[PDB]
């Protein structure tokens, strides 16, 4: 729709160097006085070790970024995370640890390249990827402190880079695991808040509940999940991990993680729910059409139903196949051409009935008045779901979604913020009213934003009283190569900017730390 | 959304009497001078024979209506169609022929109650329902002329009340039939235009092509189908006719047509295409989620794809179960309550790829640039489809759709007109831009319109240069009980009205005859 023939988006994938200390950003407009804190973000910063390239978008070495709002000025800083992967790569001047889509050549050494997200646990902050290894970091200085191996504390093989954090600091996550059956399963991990004893909360990790797997030996790729005050929602997609293949290519040949994925063509999507407080899996066989899922938007309870809002990609093909660096660095026509056969992005609201009566076999159970979502109870005992579409644009994804999480996560809500992807290229920011379907767009030419993070006005009365923060890469004609953008959350109108004189590569997720 | 607590919609289902001759309507505003012709419509007019009621909406005895535009004035007329059903009912003072949802009590006597539609064949016009019996009628006087039995001329058991008529007067339809396999199938019937020989074209009926059936002994209920210059599209829904049951309740007990229907829970929807010119069925196994379908909107070819736009109801339950007269005559709260578990209406665009390559197995084949519809080729050879949603409102159907059929039927187009159903109650008229999704609504309180028919301006330059005609029932405070509505097709703004002093019951379909 919008076109980027100048190819500026290639700057999102160009290596940068870390800083020794914070730069001072040149500020435009007016930073709100109540914005005092830090925006922390993780993404790849190093896309080749020497003349050895990294191939996939999720392979480049973790880079930790900070935009600080101190006493009426803004600074920018960045430091590579000192991971085994990074350290060993630097020691030995080559690629040492196999990344998601790049096999290294000379037990199994699983990557700790924490390029995806960062989150609070007790008084600590950890950078993560999606394996068992998270990296404790210093949120003031950006120094690496420690590697943690979650297998030491709990039985999981890995965990998402999207834990849910409750208001009391309790942390919930999900990862696959070995069941007692000698099957695969998915385990919900709970890390408690910092208690009086003042001991590291990770040492108090425990399993809340286990979800079954649709296939005994293949778990689905899980990127995120849903949490309400009373329920956990997990979506099992037809993107499957063939564990066999990476335990056959380690031994004999030589593979990466991407090589294990296969698509199951016939299962579609299975949706699973567990009672959070009683810690039981509920046996409701929710089923629907096939789609990839990376990001839940929000989840909530409305009478005897769960409302589940999702960023979907229609299809069973793995959308990550489209995310190799060569693909993303082609020119504009080839980018558009290459995405023509990709899965098509769509925001969807599914409605899952909680209180199932066989009396209603063969009818639509969704009796709520303001939705077009359906759930049908088959004789089978299967519950077949159709969504209400909330947003749909040709090869235009509303993605990397965020909400006013602190007051509205897990509860009834109205607004969602997101990054607009145009044939996979990030080129706009969106706001979406999920009840009316109104949208708002912020966009400028040759400008490539990141996930918008929302920060509440401390005296907020409405759900969107606050701002949205995005890191924007604007290559071009003598342009400030990048800047931090602050929008008014009500109408996505610009409030301010903090410009810098250096490039910033793609970042995925992060948080705003009030301090 | 809008509420009708006064219950005025019950007047759509109250018996009326025919007229001896045309009333003269009181006209408001300005009838366009180029509107000279006749609006003909069919619907039920008689909902009980004495103290024997008819139960279903599709059971009342056919009533033929005419609004005439002659020399700067408007008339209204109506005559019951003199069918076997009607005539015998009147002769014998009771219900004689079993209707769709009303069994009569004292070979098989199939109904010819032609309450659904009327269409041109050569220089003739026939009222129809969905059986093998159509009734030739006089379009000037509304007199019944003749019963026709299509089994005499072609091998079908019945035919839809939605034939497609080409610009040269050729008529296409579809009905189920016995295959040579001793299976069920669906046959495409072609009736040619009136030729030089001047013989009745029905005598020249022939079979073009046959579609297979998903179930050997159960055909799906078919209400309509798609036609482009090169293709025929047929949609096989999980609403199935159990022929066995009506050939077991005729012999032993005593049933109606509605009693034969069952829903197939596992098949979903199968979509079928045939080459119109070569008269071959194409073996592409299009499949998708379950839905009822009554009305195609329009179909067309866009490069190597068919665009299929449909008024869907999500679910496999038969929507006709909600359409008994008692249900429709309850009060407003009970109407809303009763539809809470019904299938949910949605307008959908499916995109069917024509040129299938196994090289693209597991990918999305829909490479067109302005749609979010997908089609995925499974290993199976199955092609799994997801729609682009064009309109979706909670228990608000865009239904009884019409287009500028003469210039745009079967071809690329932009606008569709429709009747808005609010928990099954007709209470608005809509226009829909199918590319942008903009809508327009005409609505007034305690007013219940019928299917909007579109008539082109004779000097039309754009697709919506013309008017839309609807019959509106407005019961109320000393109100003209009904009127004919003429809207401007561009913005659904009112141009005129032709009021009458008598009630008019529900009508389904019809045509505008330029004369
Ligand atoms: Fe993510
Ligand atoms: Fe119809
Ligand atoms: Ir302020
Ligand atoms: Ir005019």
UniProtKB/Swiss-Prot annotation, chains A, B:
It is a lipid-anchor. One of its GO terms (molecular function) is all-trans-retinyl-palmitate hydrolase, 11-cis retinol forming activity. Palmitoylation by LRAT regulates ligand binding specificity; the palmitoylated form (membrane form) specifically binds all-trans-retinyl-palmitate, while the soluble unpalmitoylated form binds all-trans-retinol (vitamin A). Binds 1 Fe(2+) ion per subunit. Critical isomerohydrolase in the retinoid cycle involved in regeneration of 11-cis-retinal, the chromophore of rod and cone opsins. Catalyzes the cleavage and isomerization of all-trans-retinyl fatty acid esters to 11-cis-retinol which is further oxidized by 11-cis retinol dehydrogenase to 11-cis-retinal for use as visual chromophore. Essential for the production of 11-cis retinal for both rod and cone photoreceptors. Also capable of catalyzing the isomerization of lutein to meso-zeaxanthin an eye-specific carotenoid. Fe cation binds at residues 162, 223, 295, 509. It comes from the Eukaryota. Its EC number is 3.1.1.64, 5.3.3.22. Signal peptide: none annotated. GO terms for biological process: detection of light stimulus involved in visual perception; retina homeostasis; retinal metabolic process; zeaxanthin biosynthetic process. The modification Phosphothreonine is found at residues 98, 102. Its cofactor is Fe(2+). It holds the Pfam family RPE65. It catalyses: an all-trans-retinyl ester + H2O = 11-cis-retinol + a fatty acid + H(+); lutein = (3R,3'S)-zeaxanthin; all-trans-retinyl hexadecanoate + H2O = 11-cis-retinol + hexadecanoate + H(+). Interacts with MYO7A; this mediates light-dependent intracellular transport of RPE65. Keywords: Acetylation, Cell membrane, Cytoplasm, Endoplasmic reticulum, Hydrolase, Iron, Isomerase, Lipid metabolism, Lipoprotein, Membrane, Metal-binding, Microsome, Palmitate, Phosphoprotein, Sensory transduction, Vision. It comes from Bos taurus. This is Retinoid isomerohydrolase. Retinal pigment epithelium specific. A lipid is attached at residues 213, 311-312 (S-palmitoyl cysteine).
């Amino acid at each position: 729709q919008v076109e980027h023939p100048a190819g500026g988006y290639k700057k999102l994938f160009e290596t940068v160097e870390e800083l020794s200390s914070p730069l001072t950003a040149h500020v435009t407009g007016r930073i709100p006085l109540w914005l005092t804190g830090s925006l922390l973000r993780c993404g790849p910063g190093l896309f080749e070790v020497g003349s050895e390239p990294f191939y996939h978008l999720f392979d480049g070495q973790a880079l930790l970024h900070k935009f600080d709002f101190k006493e009426g000025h803004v600074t920018y800083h960045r430091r590579f995370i000192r991971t085994d992967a990074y350290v060993r790569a630097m020691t030995e001047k080559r690629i040492v640890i196999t990344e998601f889509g790049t096999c290294a050549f000379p037990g199994v050494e699983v990557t700790d390249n924490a390029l995806v997200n960062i989150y609070p646990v007790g008084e600590d902050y950890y950078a993560c990827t999606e394996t068992n290894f998270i990296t404790k970091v210093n949120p003031e200085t950006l120094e690496t402190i420690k590697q943690v191996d979650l297998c030491n504390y709990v039985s999981v093989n890995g965990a998402t880079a999207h834990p849910h954090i409750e208001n009391d600091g309790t942390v919930y996550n999900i990862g696959n695991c070995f069941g007692k059956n000698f099957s695969i399963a998915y385990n919900i991990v709970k890390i408690p808040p910092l208690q009086a004893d003042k001991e590291d909360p990770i040492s108090k990790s425990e399993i809340v509940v286990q979800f079954p797997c649709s296939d005994r030996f293949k778990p689905s790729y899980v990127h995120s999940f849903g949490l309400t005050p009373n329920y956990i929602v997990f979506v099992e997609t037809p993107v499957k991990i063939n564990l066999f293949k990476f335990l056959s290519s380690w031994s004999l040949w030589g593979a990466n993680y991407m090589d294990c994925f296969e698509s199951n063509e016939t299962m579609g999507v299975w949706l699973h729910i567990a009672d959070k407080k009683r810690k039981k899996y509920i046996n409701n066989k929710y089923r629907t059409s096939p789609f990839n899922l990376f990001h839940h938007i929000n989840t909530y309870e409305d009478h005897e139903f769960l409302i589940v809002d999702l960023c979907c990609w229609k299809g069973f093909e793995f959308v990550y196949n489209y995310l190799y660096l060569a693909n993303l660095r082609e020119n504009w026509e080839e980018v558009k051409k290459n995405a023509r056969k990709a899965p098509q992005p769509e925001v969807r609201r599914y409605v899952l009935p909680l209180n199932i009566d066989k009396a209603d076999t063969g009818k639509n159970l969704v009796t709520l008045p303001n939705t077009t979502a359906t759930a049908i109870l088959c004789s089978d005992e299967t519950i077949w779901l159709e969504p209400e579409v909330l947003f749909s644009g040709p090869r235009q994804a509303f993605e990397f979604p965020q909400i006013n999480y602190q007051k509205y996560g897990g509860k009834p809500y109205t607004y969602a913020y997101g990054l607009g992807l145009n044939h996979f290229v990030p080129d706009r920011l969106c706001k979406l009213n999920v009840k009316t379907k109104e949208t708002w767009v912020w966009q400028e030419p040759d400008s490539y934003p990141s996930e918008p993070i929302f920060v509440s006005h401390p005296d907020a009365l409405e759900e969107d009283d606050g701002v949205v923060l995005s890191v924007v890469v604007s290559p071009g004609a003598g342009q400030k190569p990048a800047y931090l953008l602050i929008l008014n959350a009500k109408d996505l109108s610009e409030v301010a900017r903090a410009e810098v004189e250096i490039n910033i590569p793609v970042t995925f997720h992060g948080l705003f730390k009030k301090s």
